[PDB]
Amino acid sequence: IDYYDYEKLLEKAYQELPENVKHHKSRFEVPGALVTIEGNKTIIENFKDIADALNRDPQHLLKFLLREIATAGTLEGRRVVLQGRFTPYLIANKLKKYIKEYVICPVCGSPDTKIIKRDRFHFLKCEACGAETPIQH
Amino acid sequence: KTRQAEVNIGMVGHVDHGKTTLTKALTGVWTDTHSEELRRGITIKIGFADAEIRRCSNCGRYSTSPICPYCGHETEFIRRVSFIDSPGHEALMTTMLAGASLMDGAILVIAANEPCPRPQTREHLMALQIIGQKNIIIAQNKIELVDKEKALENYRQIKEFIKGTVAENAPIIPISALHGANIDVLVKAIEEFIPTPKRDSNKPPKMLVLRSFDVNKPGTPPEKLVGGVLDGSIVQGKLKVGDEIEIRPGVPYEEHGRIKYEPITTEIVSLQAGGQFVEEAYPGGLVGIGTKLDPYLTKGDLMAGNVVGKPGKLPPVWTDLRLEVHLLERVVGTEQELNVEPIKRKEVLLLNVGTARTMGLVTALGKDEIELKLQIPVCAEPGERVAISRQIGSRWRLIGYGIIKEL
Ligand SMILES: Nc1nc2c(ncn2[C@@H]2O[C@H](COP(=O)(O)OP(=O)(O)O)[C@@H](O)[C@H]2O)c(=O)[nH]1
Ligand SMILES: [Mg+2]
Numbered sequence: 001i002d003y004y005d006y007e008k009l010l011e012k013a014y015q016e017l018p019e020n021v022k023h024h025k026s027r028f029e030v031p032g033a034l035v036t037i038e039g040n041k042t043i044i045e046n047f048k049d050i051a052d053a054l055n056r057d058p059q060h061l062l063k064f065l066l067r068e069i070a071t072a073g074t075l076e077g078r079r080v081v082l083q084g085r086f087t088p089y090l091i092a093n094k095l096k097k098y099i100k101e102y103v104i105c106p107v108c109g110s111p112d113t114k115i116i117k118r119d120r121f122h123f124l125k126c127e128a129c130g131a132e133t134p135i136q137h
Numbered sequence: 138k139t140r141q142a143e144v145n146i147g148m149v150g151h152v153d154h155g156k157t158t159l160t161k162a163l164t165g166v167w168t169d170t171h172s173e174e175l176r177r178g179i180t181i182k183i184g185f186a187d188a189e190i191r192r193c194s195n196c197g198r199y200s201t202s203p204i205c206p207y208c209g210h211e212t213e214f215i216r217r218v219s220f221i222d223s224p225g226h227e228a229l230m231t232t233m234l235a236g237a238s239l240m241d242g243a244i245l246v247i248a249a250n251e252p253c254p255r256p257q258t259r260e261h262l263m264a265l266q267i268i269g270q271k272n273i274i275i276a277q278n279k280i281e282l283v284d285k286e287k288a289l290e291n292y293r294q295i296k297e298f299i300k301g302t303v304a305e306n307a308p309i310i311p312i313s314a315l316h317g318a319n320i321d322v323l324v325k326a327i328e329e330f331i332p333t334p335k336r337d338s339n340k341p342p343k344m345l346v347l348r349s350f351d352v353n354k355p356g357t358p359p360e361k362l363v364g365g366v367l368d369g370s371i372v373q374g375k376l377k378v379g380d381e382i383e384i385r386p387g388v389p390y391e392e393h394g395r396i397k398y399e400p401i402t403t404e405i406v407s408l409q410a411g412g413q414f415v416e417e418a419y420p421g422g423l424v425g426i427g428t429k430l431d432p433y434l435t436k437g438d439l440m441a442g443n444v445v446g447k448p449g450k451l452p453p454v455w456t457d458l459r460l461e462v463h464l465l466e467r468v469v470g471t472e473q474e475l476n477v478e479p480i481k482r483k484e485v486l487l488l489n490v491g492t493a494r495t496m497g498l499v500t501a502l503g504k505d506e507i508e509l510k511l512q513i514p515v516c517a518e519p520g521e522r523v524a525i526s527r528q529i530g531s532r533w534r535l536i537g538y539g540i541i542k543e544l
């Protein structure tokens with residue numbers, strides 16, 4: 001895809017564009033990543049804001065990351081320490097996926113999905129439609 | 138050679154469309170010691186940020202990161218570049234006109250959620266136009282803030298804005314510096330456009346010293362603890378460890394006349410470029426030279442503004458200066474500040490050439506030409522562009538530029 005075909009470039013630009021912001025149903029309160037790479041460690045000190053905006057636990061996300069990524073981190077007073085170096089977009093791309101498979105309903109898109117547990121199995125989901133997707137993916 | 142920075146990309150655009158955000162986002166991961174990720178500069182408040190453009194071997198996409206942002210595999214080094222960012226619509230402007238010999242390309246960041254040509258955005262395109270910088274990439278940012286209707290209207294606007302300019306053939310990449318929408322497309326474009334030029338390394342060396350220091354600190358070892366160190370942008374040829382260099386204006390002496398700078402010579406001990414130490418540095422990014430000089434001479438950035446090169450082959454130092462004045466048609470500011478009254482005999486101007494900054498006194502007037510005595514000698518090659526800035530109240534406002542002529 002050549003750089004002069006603005007159109008395609010535009011649609012290519014909106015798929016990467018997050019959910020909450022990309023399409024119809026918009027949880028819109030998700031503030032973008034704030035990344036600070038100090039010395040040899042990456043720190044997203046805007047974390048709380050993200051989780052609290054996604055209405056998801058704090059450590060439920062710390063994990064999803066260290067999963068998609070291979071580092072170690074600890075949460076603290078609304079910030080997070082990552083053991084290596086990660087560009088704001090690397091992280092920016094992982095949060096995108098989280099919202100997609102842990103905060104949105106695939107039948108009726110709704111930021112209102114919630115983590116539930118009705119067996120040792122983590123079926124979590126929707127307070128609006130009622131669909132209970134099995135999410136561990 | 139080194140994997141050091143091969144080209145200086147200037148980050149220009151309005152003062153809020155997002156130039157600084159995009160820069161950090163792309164350079165954050167390439168700042169390890171004695172520089173937490175981002176800060177602006179000395180007199181040319183210019184700032185240099187390095188970034189390694191890499192290619193994901195698995196998905197095939199480009200980024201500025203070691204681990205593919207998307208798939209997660211290891212990326213491959215393709216090149217190292219350096220962005221020149223600067224908070225302050227003026228400072229950038231001054232830098233561009235003055236040290237146009239530093240940039241090799243520029244990335245015009247234009248916010249999509251505002252009328253295309255903003256007062257400031259025009260001035261840069263105006264500056265880029267004046268220094269013959271044609272290698273330009275346009276970054277329509279904040280695409281996530283305008284529905285596809287407005288976006289296309291903005292796109293069109295930009296197109297009308299650039300036609301008949303140096304950025305007439307520049308791509309218009311819709312991106313999101315915040316979320317990273319199309320950063321891969323962008324980074325890739327930096328390779329398509331703005332490639333490393335063909336430079337004949339054999340040309341005699343010339344470096345514009347941006348800063349000078351005394352890395353010494355009561356660490357106390359008395360042995361071979363480093364001497365004076367200079368940081369600058371090689372702009373011609375190359376410097377090599379073990380090279381004998383000639384600093385330009387030089388060190389001042391005790392009033393025989395009043396003030397007199399004598400050119401000084403020293404030997405290069407070390408060279409930092411790309412985060413490591415090399416035996417040979419080239420243009421692109423910042424270069425940290427280590428000398429055998431008395432740190433007492435470079436401490437406090439006194440050497441700043443000087444030029445380095447091989448003894449004999451350097452520019453001509455000047456004590457006086459005539460210039461081919463060209464006042465600019467500025468739009469940013471207030472009507473007063475705007476319509477610049479022509480320079481007057483005896484007015485005290487602020488001059489910028491290379492990395493040197495000095496006050497000059499207008500001692501002559503002609504037709505679109507003037508004369509000036511320098512407060513501080515400045516090392517310059519005739520034909521080189523000099524930034525001219527008048528005061529206007531408490532601040533210093535750029536009113537135009539002059540062309541170095543012979544007296
Ligand atoms: N929504 C959104 N905001 C952005 C984007 N890029 C930059 N910004 C915001 O625009 C403002 C900053 O632009 P900034 O970095 O200050 O611009 P500068 O003034 O040219 O230095 C900040 O609030 C940024 O976080 C983007 O892609 N999307
Ligand atoms: Mg800024």
Ligand SMILES: [Zn+2]
Nearest residue numbers: 105108126129
């Ligand atoms: Zn649902």
Ligand SMILES: [Zn+2]
Nearest residue numbers: 193196205208
């Ligand atoms: Zn990849």
